[PDB]
Amino acid sequence: QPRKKRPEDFKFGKILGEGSFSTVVLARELATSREYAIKILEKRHIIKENKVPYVTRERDVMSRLDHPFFVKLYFTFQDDEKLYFGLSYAKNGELLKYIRKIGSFDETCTRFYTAEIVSALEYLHGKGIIHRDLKPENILLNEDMHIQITDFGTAKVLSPESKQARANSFVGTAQYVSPELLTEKSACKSSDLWALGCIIYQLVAGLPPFRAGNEGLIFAKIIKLEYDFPEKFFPKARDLVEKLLVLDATKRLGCEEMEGYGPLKAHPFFESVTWENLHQQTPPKLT
């Protein structure tokens, strides 16, 4: 392995963002001149806030990933005060920023970005991992405008030894949380497909489908499947969303009980998509 890195091996630049318990800084490694986004956590805070399992989970999960549509974890290190994660830098930031600025994506852009998310989930689920907090804030964009999914401290590696399907930790974001987590108190891979349906809806409509000024109101709508489509919504995309936003998690297109990603990739909304080539394709410009 390469020499373990230390803070003094880098020059830090701007803060890229600040979370409730972490700060991400842009950094240049002196010996190479490479750029990294380094996520830095104060140990005393992680302890106070009961976040040790989160930090451990983030490292363990990201260490297993090796796919172009995910933020890469290159290294970790620590000192007396802090934990450090050396991540790929996604220069163009959050997908959410683009939704806010443009309001709606056109059909070509919706299809392209949805296809990348589907490709990423196929990989993640193939490794028996549930994301559990999939949302536009956690889909970053690299310099070439391909996706880089992030935020794995609330992900779950399902145990292959027990053929585990359900995860019991209560994690997520209200607009994207699945009805099974609310009613049955567990999530499954298909919970991410529910989140996918909410995201596709959001790209086209400009708002996620279950929305309210507080969480409990959103929960009430999710479990009733209470949402509507705006009058103009690409029809094949509406069909796809209606096949993802299904209360019964065993009936969502793409889930294991529905025979997996093949039928999802075969949906008519994706007819023009070349799946094998996506990360090397030039993304359509977002206008």
Ligand SMILES: Nc1ncnc2c1ncn2[C@@H]1O[C@H](COP(=O)(O)OP(=O)(O)OP(=O)(O)O)[C@@H](O)[C@H]1O
């Ligand atoms: N790999 C990266 N490249 C570029 N920006 C990043 C990267 N990882 C995280 N960020 C940005 O850094 C900011 C802080 O991220 P961080 O994980 O610390 O908190 P968060 O996910 O925004 O909030 P919370 O963790 O409280 O839910 C976020 O806005 C994120 O968009």
Ligand SMILES: O=C(O)[C@@H]1CCC(=O)N(CCc2ccc(Cl)cc2)[C@H]1c1ccccc1Cl
């Ligand atoms: O578990 C691991 O893979 C490593 C191994 C080295 C190590 O001791 N740690 C961190 C242990 C830890 C976690 C949280 C706090 Cl608040 C303090 C110590 C883990 C760690 C080191 C650096 C950066 C992140 C992490 Cl999770």
Ligand code: NA
């Ligand atoms: Na996040």
Ligand code: NA
């Ligand atoms: Na985060």
Ligand code: NA
């Ligand atoms: Na959340």
